[PDB]
Design a protein around this ligand. Structure first.
Ligand SMILES: CN(C)c1cc(CN)ccn1
Lengths: 39, 156
């Protein structure tokens, strides 16, 4: 049995930690909702 | 049950203790999460019940109590924030510049941030605080890193 619990408000935080890169990838999406890389 | 707008953890007591299997967004009385988090099962909110209303395995999305309400889109240029809700940890905002998933049916924004599986369904926001998609359906690239699509539904 699944249940939900509030975790917070949805707001943009000024001066949040900024990280992660921006990869441009060729991908395929199958009928089961799985993404895979196209090489 | 609690119907206040916001981000919520999706929990289960079926396994050992209480386990966080995902996250979702309550907006305009509708709960939005990824299909792989609930597999379309009903949810509990206190003493109340949330029944699925719409879902699609291929988009990997599901809405409860009403139709999908989130319609904002990434502008293709600006940084966004993942409002990550990790298992057993406080909600945290992480800012990033999305990359792209190029597909035969068009391009989708993608965020290169690696969080546990139980963080699936965490919302990705624009500078106005609007939810532009949910985090948690993606791919593992060459170096073993995770890149999630910015998955957004259609508002009928
Ligand atoms: C579904 N999520 C958030 C995942 C998935 C994986 C699968 N490699 C790794 C890390 N996080």
């Amino acid at each position: 049995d699944m249940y939900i619990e509030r975790a917070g408000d949805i707001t943009w935080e000024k001066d949040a930690e900024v990280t992660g890169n921006s990869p441009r990838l060729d991908v395929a999406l199958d009928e089961s909702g799985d993404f895979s890389l196209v090489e | 049950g609690e119907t206040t707008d916001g981000v919520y953890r999706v929990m289960t007591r079926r396994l050992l203790g209480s386990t966080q299997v995902g996250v979702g967004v309550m907006q305009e009385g509708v709960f939005h999460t990824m299909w792989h988090v609930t597999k379309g099962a009903a949810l509990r909110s206190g003493e109340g019940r949330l029944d699925p209303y719409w879902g699609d395995v291929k988009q990997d999305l599901v809405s409860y109590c009403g139709p999908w309400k989130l319609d904002a889109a990434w502008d293709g240029l600006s940084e966004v924030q993942l409002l990550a809700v990790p298992p057993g940890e406080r909600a945290k905002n992480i800012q990033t510049l999305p990359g792209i998933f190029k597909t035969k049916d068009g391009d989708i924004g993608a965020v290169a941030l690696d969080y546990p599986a139980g963080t699936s369904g965490s919302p990705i926001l624009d500078k106005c605080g609007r939810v532009i998609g949910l985090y948690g359906n993606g791919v593992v690239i060459k170096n073993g890193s995770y890149v999630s699509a910015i998955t957004q539904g259609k508002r009928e």
